[PDB]
Amino acid sequence: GSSGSSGVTYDDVHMNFTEEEWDLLDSSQKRLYEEVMLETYQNLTDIGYNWQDHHIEESGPSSG
């Protein structure tokens, strides 16, 4: 910005409920936090092709 940085205010974490807090929430919040998870986690089938397959022969010589 000007010199360095001492803010980093993303302003996108107004629902970071932890395990403990999860118990102090309501039915709406408990579902709201999941509405975003299920949307961005299980509904991700548009990644594309898949050809990432490697094979290791494994060989450790010991001659000499």
TrEMBL record:
<feature type="domain" description="KRAB">
    <location>
        <begin position="8"/>
        <end position="58"/>
    </location>
</feature>
<dbReference type="GO" id="GO:0005634">
    <property type="term" value="C:nucleus"/>
</dbReference>
<dbReference type="GO" id="GO:0006355">
    <property type="term" value="P:regulation of DNA-templated transcription"/>
</dbReference>
<keyword id="KW-0863">Zinc-finger</keyword>
<keyword id="KW-0479">Metal-binding</keyword>
<protein>
    <submittedName>
        <fullName>Zinc finger protein 1006</fullName>
    </submittedName>
</protein>
<keyword id="KW-0677">Repeat</keyword>
<dbReference type="GO" id="GO:0008270">
    <property type="term" value="F:zinc ion binding"/>
</dbReference>
<keyword id="KW-0862">Zinc</keyword>
